[PDB]
Structure 1
Amino acid sequence: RSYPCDEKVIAECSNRRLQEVPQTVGKYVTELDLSDNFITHITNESFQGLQNLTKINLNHNPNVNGLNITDGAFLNLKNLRELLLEDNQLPQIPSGLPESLTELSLIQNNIYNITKEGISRLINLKNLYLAWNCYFNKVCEKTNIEDGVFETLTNLELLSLSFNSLSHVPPKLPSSLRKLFLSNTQIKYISEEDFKGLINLTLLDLSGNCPRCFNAPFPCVPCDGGASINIDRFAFQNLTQLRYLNLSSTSLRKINAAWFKNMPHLKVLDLEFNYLVGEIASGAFLTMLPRLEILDLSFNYIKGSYPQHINISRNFSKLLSLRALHLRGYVFQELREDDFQPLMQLPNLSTINLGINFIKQIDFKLFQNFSNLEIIYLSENRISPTDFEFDPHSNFYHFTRPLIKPQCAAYGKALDLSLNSIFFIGPNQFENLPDIACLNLSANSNAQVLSGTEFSAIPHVKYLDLTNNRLDFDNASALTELSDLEVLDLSYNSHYFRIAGVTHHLEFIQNFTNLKVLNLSHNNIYTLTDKYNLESKSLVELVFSGNRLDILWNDDDNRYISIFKGLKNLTRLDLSLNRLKHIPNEAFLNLPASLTELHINDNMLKFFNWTLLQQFPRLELLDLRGNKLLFLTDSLSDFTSSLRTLLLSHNRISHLPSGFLSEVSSLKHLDLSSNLLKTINKSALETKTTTKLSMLELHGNPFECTCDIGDFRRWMDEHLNVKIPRLVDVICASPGDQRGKSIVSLE
């Protein structure tokens, strides 16, 4: 049983409050992650017993001044390939690094000198990350790059120098380079010589040089006069393998078509945060890009300007390989059919993104004229009836999550109208739309009574997101025009459910033939009109967290005692966050016998009637985390043969009953973290049967570390197939000499 790391050859040793490199790491280990510890010193002794190490991660030590690394500390590790030293306040590149390194990352340090002595003997480097050493209003020096320092790195494939003050492209780069990142480097001019020999390059990032600074979310310094980056006509002429070009925030007003003349493979062009309204309308460069797949022209708005219409050049029609066009933040009032003519015959154009344009009106019928749209993204418009802020490993100019949740988009064509002002759906709201399978109307403040006709023009919606609205459930036929509906999200429509005196009709649920997943979370449901029961022959999953079952199941009221019973196909039920202090026995028995997964976490349960598990023969997962439970039954196997996972974290359990660990044969994963256990007695340990337990969680219990723990420790020694994670957090509260130590580190 490894300690302090979890081994599996990989050693997960991160975030463990470690103060030095442990001398206890399995000597077979090949990758070791010690990130986020409190390590302050690395010497030639730190890794002495571990010469099979391929990979070391030391990022973010010491985690709350800097990591002190001796010359040659690593130089004896002969197989070391990957060394991660991010966010360690290093004042220099460490001296005497091993020649074997293929990957070195020094992101987010204080290194202002890149020197031959540091780097040049690292002949095997493929990827070198030096970004984010001097930037914004950090107090730091201009980066000195020693002439020719990278010239000997003849296998170098990726070099990243972004977010440092460089002023010029470094000369003498190796022609092995595939990816060169030079974002936010204060380079104002790109000469013909700068990228001259780089015939293998596939990615060039020159974003944030001569930035567009209006409304910047960071301290931003424009080029004089807010001028554009100055890229020589021939700067790209030998970049024949280029696939990705990032020119975001280079204050461009003109794009020279001749930049692309030798660039037949360009697939992704990023031109966000420039001043390209004119070029978008004229667009001579568009001719050069018939193989482009992604064009991002987001946030090129003219500030203060809110024109009626977007002006797209007819030459967009040349972008014959286009798959996604991103046009956030152009900012305009109205989208008319004619305005997108140029895009309508593009054969592979799957995605159109018009997020964040403050658009007031759209002629929806225009989307039908497109060849092949799968994603119509119109969120955030005005349609109506550690202790650094930026992730160095992520795109700086846009978020890279999918525009549509994958689970919704998997059904078919997607229309996302979230975060607009469609406060009711009128009779003709969805006229002349493609055949939408995936519809997002989240956060429109929709207060309407859905009545069974609102979705008639798009009747094959299968995944409907209506979260964060204020729907008035006064009509039992609501949404029944959607016969194929499979997923329905009604989360955060509490507005009218909170009001006792208006009607709340949920009867429509029963009308769906194919409804599989229903989310009613965070609605504050405490009262329903006429019918008190939810019923469906199809429903598999009901999320009912964040409601008031404490009131629906009050002891003085019988009406809701069968509320979920009529959900006869149900396998997953979430009753978390319902302020439950007790469940009446009859209510529990009325939960569907079909269940396999039951969550009642984050309530206030003082007691749980285990005997009632007899009625749930298919029940695999029972989640009671975050309650106030005091005891377990001492004959749990009498009550279930199906239970595979039992989660009891964050309760007030102080005693295990005899045999409990091995009571139940089906039980693989028992979570007793953060309870009130002082020991586990031999009594809890006696079985006649082989335990099938695979994971037992125990961190955060106030263990009593005296001789009375020895039985449990031997049990541990005798059942290594039972994984106990976070041994470093399985801690003695007592006695004094033991307090804070892992129960494992005692004699």
Structure 2
Amino acid sequence: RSYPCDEKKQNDSVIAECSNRRLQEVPQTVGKYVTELDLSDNFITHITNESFQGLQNLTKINLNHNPNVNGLNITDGAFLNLKNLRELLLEDNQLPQIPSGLPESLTELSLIQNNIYNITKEGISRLINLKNLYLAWNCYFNKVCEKTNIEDGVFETLTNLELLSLSFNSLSHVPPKLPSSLRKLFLSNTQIKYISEEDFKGLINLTLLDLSGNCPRCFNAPFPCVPCDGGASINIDRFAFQNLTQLRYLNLSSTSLRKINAAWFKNMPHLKVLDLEFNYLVGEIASGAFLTMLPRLEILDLSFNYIKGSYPQHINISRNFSKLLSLRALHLRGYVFQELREDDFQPLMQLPNLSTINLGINFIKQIDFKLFQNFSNLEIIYLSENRISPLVKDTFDPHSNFYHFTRPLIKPQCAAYGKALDLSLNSIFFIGPNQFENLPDIACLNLSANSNAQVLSGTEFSAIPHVKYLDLTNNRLDFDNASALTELSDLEVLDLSYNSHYFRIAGVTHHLEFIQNFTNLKVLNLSHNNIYTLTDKYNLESKSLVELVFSGNRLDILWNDDDNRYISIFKGLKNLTRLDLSLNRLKHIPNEAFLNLPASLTELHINDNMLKFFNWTLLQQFPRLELLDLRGNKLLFLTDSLSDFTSSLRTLLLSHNRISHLPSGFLSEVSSLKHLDLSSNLLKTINKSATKLSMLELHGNPFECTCDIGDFRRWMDEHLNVKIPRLVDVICASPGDQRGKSIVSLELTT
């Protein structure tokens, strides 16, 4: 670690981190060692020939977000210097023009979120070895520019260009004279309404094309959005893509398509993913004209093609959907329909490869759960945000994808265990006794936020006893009855976060006895169940359990139990490694209670409590403990003799406490501490009296910079490997002459 840039080594290339250090010029310490430089989130506004000299070993400069609040001054040839400069990022800098005078060694140039309106030869016709060029957000509702002007041939010379991102800019036409070497052409939100034959004449190599937000369909647009001539459509000629033989991805989101010409995929048997969401294509879904041309598609998205004023009975799926033999996921979010039958999805049932169906936000009230058994390999069923009821009787970031969320539908940690079903945000206020009948073998089940008030008695998941991951978060479930969920003999993950039932009985209040007949349950989350009361004893004997979260409960109220009934409330869980006691409003954990914790614990969090006094001396029973998180507490003091107490602990987060005095016998035991966190306490000074540590957090402590402090800065220098995060945020409170400056940029003994 040198000041002002924390330094670390990756590969045979030294990287320098000077981001968010608030500096106003190119730093000084940066040795010729450095090869990739990071300068983002600063207050720099000047870049000269002198800024970058001597460093010639540099291949890269980050430099985005400068200054942070005219723009940022770049001098003709301030970079012409370095013959190693590969990548050069300059996003969000308020640049008026394209840096005049630039290195040829440049491969990947970024220039987005600036004020470049002229695109000129004088700027970029020299960077031949340019590969990836980004230029989104440059004439995007600035009104000091009608069109992003591009001068002819500004792309025909950059013969090594693979990627061009002109998305989110104001062009009316498609830039002529591009290089045939192109592979990705991003042009979203560019205001193109006419697409010619010529526009894409001879990019025979192009793989991805992105034409969204052209004539948008402003459902929930996270940015300025303006529709075409009423319900007007982006107008695409049939021979627009004749040449585009090599092509995997097509994103035609928000174009307001009504009719899909099927002449477009005539010469393109390649295409792997089609995005046709936020359009008007209900007719085309039903009359699948193009649906014939796509045998190698694996993912299809037709989401938010719903018609205003409409709520059909059923969803009209063309037969031409059985020509989609390669499909692996289908995305049908927000058609909006009332009932799904076996019939309606008939065309998809003889599709061999289809493994995800996405039906969320379709506000559907009834589905035949049988119809899902006629699939040959499905393990994702997403039905979130529909109106399924209890069943009775019947046996900002531009680097992102705006039109298609890339987060997993289900949690991987769940989609692991087998077939995943998501019934979250539905109307299942209790569990109908027919709720699960005709369901495939379910491994992963989400019932999140159904305000489900079901008394559980162990009957309810009988149709599906083979569940592993079950998520019941945000519900009003009762499980005072000990038979509760016990049908689920294979269950490993129970997520019961935030549950208040409606059947409090006195002396039955909370009854966890039901945990004990699990032979296989590993993760148990009971956060925010507001338990202040057990009628099950303190013995919860289970060797299955590894991790228990017990946040948002009332541990205090239990441990003030006047007859002392609640001491070993966790002893029985012998195999517990991780435990979580945060937000239980704890003041004094009685000594005998703390000593009755699984001797097996690896992590222990008692943070965001009200803790005053910690009896450190009790850490001797916990010899596997690697992490102790005591953050957000009212702790004053630290044991002078940590030696006596532990030799297993690796991480000790203490921040947001009221620690004034850091004692003398720190590092008295082989403390195994690589990571020590003391930031946001009440430290005036660190004495002299106080090599295995790589991290120390001190930021935001009232430092008293008097020379009395200078012992510490000698230690910060003898021991130079131990990194301090945001050094520049460890500051002087005092004295007056000092208040504001960093401990490190401090002229000492004067």
Distance across 1 between alignment mates of 2:132 and 2:337: 43
The alpha-carbon distance between structure 1 residues 608 and 678, as it changes in their structure 2 partners (threshold 3 A), is: same
Distance across 1 between alignment mates of 2:707 and 2:228: 71
Identity %: 100
Aligned-pair CA distance for 1:531: 3.3
Question: Does structure 1 retain, via aligned residues, the 8 Å contact 2:732–2:743?
Answer: yes
Distance across 2 between alignment mates of 1:201 and 1:288: 19
Question: Does structure 2 retain, via aligned residues, the 8 Å contact 1:470–1:494?
Answer: yes
Q: Which moved more, 1:522-531 or 1:490-499?
A: 490-499
Task: Classify the secondary structure of the residue corresponding to 1:518.
Answer: strand
Aligned-pair CA distance for 1:384: 1.1
Q: Which moved more, 1:413-422 or 1:56-65?
A: 56-65
Distance across 2 between alignment mates of 1:628 and 1:47: 48
Give the structure 2 partner of residue 706 of structure 1. Answer: 706
Question: Does structure 1 retain, via aligned residues, the 8 Å contact 2:436–2:463?
Answer: yes
Question: Does structure 1 retain, via aligned residues, the 8 Å contact 2:665–2:689?
Answer: yes
Aligned-pair CA distance for 1:136: 5.2
Question: Does structure 2 retain, via aligned residues, the 8 Å contact 1:447–1:469?
Answer: yes
Task: Classify the secondary structure of the residue corresponding to 1:408.
Answer: helix
Question: Does structure 1 retain, via aligned residues, the 8 Å contact 2:489–2:518?
Answer: yes
The alpha-carbon distance between structure 1 residues 389 and 470, as it changes in their structure 2 partners (threshold 3 A), is: closer
Aligned-pair CA distance for 1:731: 2.0
Aligned-pair CA distance for 1:258: 1.4
Question: Does structure 1 retain, via aligned residues, the 8 Å contact 2:296–2:326?
Answer: yes
The alpha-carbon distance between structure 1 residues 481 and 746, as it changes in their structure 2 partners (threshold 3 A), is: same
Runs of 4 or more off by more than 6 Å in structure 1?
Answer: 497-502
Aligned-pair CA distance for 1:294: 0.8
1:721 matches 2:721: yes
Task: Classify the secondary structure of the residue corresponding to 1:31.
Answer: strand
Distance across 2 between alignment mates of 1:119 and 1:296: 37
Q: Which moved more, 1:216-225 or 1:63-72?
A: 216-225
Q: Which moved more, 1:280-289 or 1:68-77?
A: 68-77
Aligned-pair CA distance for 1:474: 3.0
Question: Does structure 2 retain, via aligned residues, the 8 Å contact 1:662–1:692?
Answer: no
The alpha-carbon distance between structure 1 residues 328 and 139, as it changes in their structure 2 partners (threshold 3 A), is: farther
Aligned-pair CA distance for 1:252: 0.9
Distance across 1 between alignment mates of 2:229 and 2:651: 63
Aligned-pair CA distance for 1:530: 4.2
User: Which residues of 2 match residues 55-204 of structure 1 at below 5 A?
Assistant: 55-135=60-140, 140-204=145-209
Aligned-pair CA distance for 1:550: 2.1
The alpha-carbon distance between structure 1 residues 666 and 452, as it changes in their structure 2 partners (threshold 3 A), is: same
Question: Does structure 1 retain, via aligned residues, the 8 Å contact 2:395–2:437?
Answer: no
CA deviation profile, 1:434-470 (whole Å, cap 9, x unmatched): 1111000011110111111111111111000000111
Distance across 2 between alignment mates of 1:336 and 1:663: 68
Aligned-pair CA distance for 1:642: 1.4
Q: Which moved more, 1:393-402 or 1:42-51?
A: 42-51
Aligned-pair CA distance for 1:325: 0.6
Aligned-pair CA distance for 1:192: 0.7
Question: Does structure 1 retain, via aligned residues, the 8 Å contact 2:644–2:669?
Answer: no
The alpha-carbon distance between structure 1 residues 28 and 350, as it changes in their structure 2 partners (threshold 3 A), is: same
Distance across 2 between alignment mates of 1:213 and 1:623: 46
Distance across 1 between alignment mates of 2:671 and 2:698: 20
Q: Which moved more, 1:130-139 or 1:268-277?
A: 130-139
Distance across 1 between alignment mates of 2:693 and 2:319: 66
Aligned-pair CA distance for 1:138: 6.5
Question: Does structure 2 retain, via aligned residues, the 8 Å contact 1:565–1:592?
Answer: yes
The alpha-carbon distance between structure 1 residues 171 and 712, as it changes in their structure 2 partners (threshold 3 A), is: same
Task: Classify the secondary structure of the residue corresponding to 2:238.
Answer: coil
Aligned-pair CA distance for 1:82: 1.0
The alpha-carbon distance between structure 1 residues 140 and 579, as it changes in their structure 2 partners (threshold 3 A), is: farther
Question: Does structure 2 retain, via aligned residues, the 8 Å contact 1:359–1:383?
Answer: yes
Distance across 1 between alignment mates of 2:6 and 2:215: 47
Question: Does structure 1 retain, via aligned residues, the 8 Å contact 2:516–2:540?
Answer: yes
Aligned-pair CA distance for 1:158: 0.5
Give the structure 2 partner of residue 688 of structure 1. Answer: none
Task: Classify the secondary structure of the residue corresponding to 1:376.
Answer: strand
CA deviation profile, 1:292-325 (whole Å, cap 9, x unmatched): 0111100001111000000111110010110111
Aligned-pair CA distance for 1:68: 2.4
The alpha-carbon distance between structure 1 residues 436 and 727, as it changes in their structure 2 partners (threshold 3 A), is: same
CA deviation profile, 1:378-422 (whole Å, cap 9, x unmatched): 01111111xx99420101112210111110011111001111111
CA deviation profile, 1:153-206 (whole Å, cap 9, x unmatched): 111110011111101110000011000011111111111111111011000001
1:279 matches 2:284: yes
Aligned-pair CA distance for 1:49: 3.5
The alpha-carbon distance between structure 1 residues 526 and 139, as it changes in their structure 2 partners (threshold 3 A), is: farther
The alpha-carbon distance between structure 1 residues 592 and 83, as it changes in their structure 2 partners (threshold 3 A), is: same
Question: Does structure 2 retain, via aligned residues, the 8 Å contact 1:497–1:527?
Answer: no
Task: Classify the secondary structure of the residue corresponding to 1:325.
Answer: strand
Q: Which moved more, 1:317-326 or 1:28-37?
A: 28-37
Distance across 2 between alignment mates of 1:722 and 1:217: 42
Aligned-pair CA distance for 1:736: 3.2
CA deviation profile, 1:674-710 (whole Å, cap 9, x unmatched): 22222222211xxxxxx32222222222222232233
The alpha-carbon distance between structure 1 residues 566 and 290, as it changes in their structure 2 partners (threshold 3 A), is: same
Distance across 1 between alignment mates of 2:231 and 2:506: 59
Distance across 2 between alignment mates of 1:713 and 1:498: 60
Aligned-pair CA distance for 1:69: 2.1
Aligned-pair CA distance for 1:730: 2.2
Question: Does structure 2 retain, via aligned residues, the 8 Å contact 1:126–1:156?
Answer: yes
Question: Of residues 576, 588, 594 in structure 1, which corresponds to 2:600?
Answer: 594
1:405 matches 2:411: yes
Aligned-pair CA distance for 1:734: 2.4
Distance across 2 between alignment mates of 1:9 and 1:472: 57
Aligned-pair CA distance for 1:253: 1.3
Give the structure 1 partner of residue 736 of structure 2. Answer: 736
Give the structure 2 partner of residue 254 of structure 1. Answer: 259
Aligned-pair CA distance for 1:209: 1.1
Question: Of residues 651, 661, 673 in structure 1, which corresponds to 2:657?
Answer: 651
Q: How many residues align?
A: 739
The alpha-carbon distance between structure 1 residues 736 and 188, as it changes in their structure 2 partners (threshold 3 A), is: same
Question: Does structure 2 retain, via aligned residues, the 8 Å contact 1:517–1:542?
Answer: yes
Task: Classify the secondary structure of the residue corresponding to 1:613.
Answer: helix
CA deviation profile, 1:241-297 (whole Å, cap 9, x unmatched): 100011111111111211111101100111011111011001021111000011110
Question: Of residues 23, 31, 44 in structure 1, which corresponds to 2:49?
Answer: 44
Aligned-pair CA distance for 1:567: 1.1
Aligned-pair CA distance for 1:24: 2.3
Aligned-pair CA distance for 1:139: 5.9
CA deviation profile, 1:470-524 (whole Å, cap 9, x unmatched): 1122311111000110111000113559998973222111111011101111222
Question: Does structure 2 retain, via aligned residues, the 8 Å contact 1:266–1:289?
Answer: yes
The alpha-carbon distance between structure 1 residues 736 and 22, as it changes in their structure 2 partners (threshold 3 A), is: farther
1:316 matches 2:321: yes
Q: Which runs of no fewer than 5 residues in structure 1 stay unpaired?
A: 685-690
Q: Which moved more, 1:130-139 or 1:96-105?
A: 130-139
1:603 matches 2:609: yes
Aligned-pair CA distance for 1:45: 2.0
Aligned-pair CA distance for 1:97: 1.9
Q: Which moved more, 1:291-300 or 1:55-64?
A: 55-64
Distance across 2 between alignment mates of 1:736 and 1:290: 74
Q: Which moved more, 1:309-318 or 1:505-514?
A: 505-514
Distance across 2 between alignment mates of 1:520 and 1:382: 27
Aligned-pair CA distance for 1:236: 0.4
Task: Classify the secondary structure of the residue corresponding to 2:58.
Answer: coil
Question: Does structure 1 retain, via aligned residues, the 8 Å contact 2:513–2:536?
Answer: no
Distance across 1 between alignment mates of 2:50 and 2:490: 65
The alpha-carbon distance between structure 1 residues 349 and 398, as it changes in their structure 2 partners (threshold 3 A), is: same
Give the structure 1 partner of residue 537 of structure 2. Answer: 531
Question: Does structure 2 retain, via aligned residues, the 8 Å contact 1:41–1:69?
Answer: yes
Give the structure 2 partner of residue 687 of structure 1. Answer: none
The alpha-carbon distance between structure 1 residues 209 and 348, as it changes in their structure 2 partners (threshold 3 A), is: same
Give the structure 2 partner of residue 289 of structure 1. Answer: 294
Distance across 1 between alignment mates of 2:502 and 2:614: 32
CA deviation profile, 1:2-24 (whole Å, cap 9, x unmatched): 11111191111111212222122
Task: Classify the secondary structure of the residue corresponding to 2:263.
Answer: helix
Q: TM-score, normalised by structure 2?
A: 0.95
Distance across 1 between alignment mates of 2:257 and 2:640: 73
Q: Which moved more, 1:708-717 or 1:263-272?
A: 708-717
Task: Classify the secondary structure of the residue corresponding to 1:58.
Answer: coil
The alpha-carbon distance between structure 1 residues 407 and 63, as it changes in their structure 2 partners (threshold 3 A), is: same
Q: TM-score, normalised by structure 1?
A: 0.96
Task: Classify the secondary structure of the residue corresponding to 1:699.
Answer: coil
Q: Which moved more, 1:6-15 or 1:344-353?
A: 6-15
The alpha-carbon distance between structure 1 residues 501 and 68, as it changes in their structure 2 partners (threshold 3 A), is: farther
Q: Which moved more, 1:695-704 or 1:429-438?
A: 695-704
The alpha-carbon distance between structure 1 residues 229 and 42, as it changes in their structure 2 partners (threshold 3 A), is: same
